[PDB]
Amino acid sequence: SIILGILG
């Protein structure tokens, strides 16, 4: 995830 910075 681009928003989270983790898990893609």
mmCIF file with all atom_site columns, C-alpha atoms in Angstrom:
data_model
loop_
_atom_site.group_PDB
_atom_site.id
_atom_site.type_symbol
_atom_site.label_atom_id
_atom_site.label_alt_id
_atom_site.label_comp_id
_atom_site.label_asym_id
_atom_site.label_entity_id
_atom_site.label_seq_id
_atom_site.pdbx_PDB_ins_code
_atom_site.Cartn_x
_atom_site.Cartn_y
_atom_site.Cartn_z
_atom_site.occupancy
_atom_site.B_iso_or_equiv
_atom_site.pdbx_formal_charge
_atom_site.auth_seq_id
_atom_site.auth_comp_id
_atom_site.auth_asym_id
_atom_site.auth_atom_id
_atom_site.pdbx_PDB_model_num
ATOM 1 C CA . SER A 1 1 ? 0.000  0.000  0.000  1.00 0.00 ? 1 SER A CA 1
ATOM 2 C CA . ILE A 1 2 ? 1.343  3.371  -1.108 1.00 0.00 ? 2 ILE A CA 1
ATOM 3 C CA . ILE A 1 3 ? -0.686 5.098  1.647  1.00 0.00 ? 3 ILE A CA 1
ATOM 4 C CA . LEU A 1 4 ? 0.499  2.790  4.471  1.00 0.00 ? 4 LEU A CA 1
ATOM 5 C CA . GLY A 1 5 ? 4.090  2.225  3.351  1.00 0.00 ? 5 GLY A CA 1
ATOM 6 C CA . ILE A 1 6 ? 3.647  -1.535 3.961  1.00 0.00 ? 6 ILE A CA 1
ATOM 7 C CA . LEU A 1 7 ? 1.793  -4.530 2.467  1.00 0.00 ? 7 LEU A CA 1
ATOM 8 C CA . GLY A 1 8 ? 2.110  -3.022 -1.002 1.00 0.00 ? 8 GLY A CA 1
#
